Amino acid sequence: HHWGYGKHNGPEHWHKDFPIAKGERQSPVDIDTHTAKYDPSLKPLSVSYDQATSLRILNNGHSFNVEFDDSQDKAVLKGGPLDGTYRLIQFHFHWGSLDGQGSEHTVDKKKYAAELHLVHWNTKYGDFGKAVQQPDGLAVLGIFLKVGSAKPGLQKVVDVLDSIKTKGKSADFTNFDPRGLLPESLDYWTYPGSLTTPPLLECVTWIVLKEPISVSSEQVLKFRKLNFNGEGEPEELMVDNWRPAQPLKNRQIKASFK
Ligand SMILES: [Zn+2]
Q1: How many domains does the chain have?
Q2: Catalytic residue at 2?
């Protein structure tokens, strides 16, 4: 039926509707710390989220994402392994039924409690729609969440979730500065991949940060109260909305740090 994260419509069934699920540059992957190659040519990430314009927060039945106004070159990402400018369009998360799982990428098979994705599209393509048709159309910044002390910047997100519990619910979410979601260090691993949810197009350059951000179990707990279902339907908890590691195939993961 329609895709989901369930046993009958989840990850292992996607290939029937999206044959590319069995492609050559599918994401996510496991990051083996000693087959990853340090590449000294990799420049540092250049982030300019100081003029980001959040618009709203929405539960789409798969996750919840915050939309931004990507009309101007306000919040852009560049540097790193990228050529050109990428515009921030939205961010969302993946989490699990328990703290010990939830991230999509793993480091040496280690899973994190969650994973945040800041999605950006290559401006030379004119728009998000055309960009996803290109192998270099999107740049996704991936950030791991570990349970520890609270992240002050995630507090505003965690608090509004209550009012968008079921699929279809939206809320004006203005003035949220995504800079409070970033770790101290910008060291990263990078590899060519895909979108982790259908259509699973292989149009993404992945940038996964080495340093995870800490969030309190209190904060993580709130993600688990969202529902996959719409209002007035069989209540099914939004948990374990993550896709498992895919074969790395002929790819090499590069590290910006020795
Ligand atoms: Zn994602």
Answers
A1: 1
A2: no
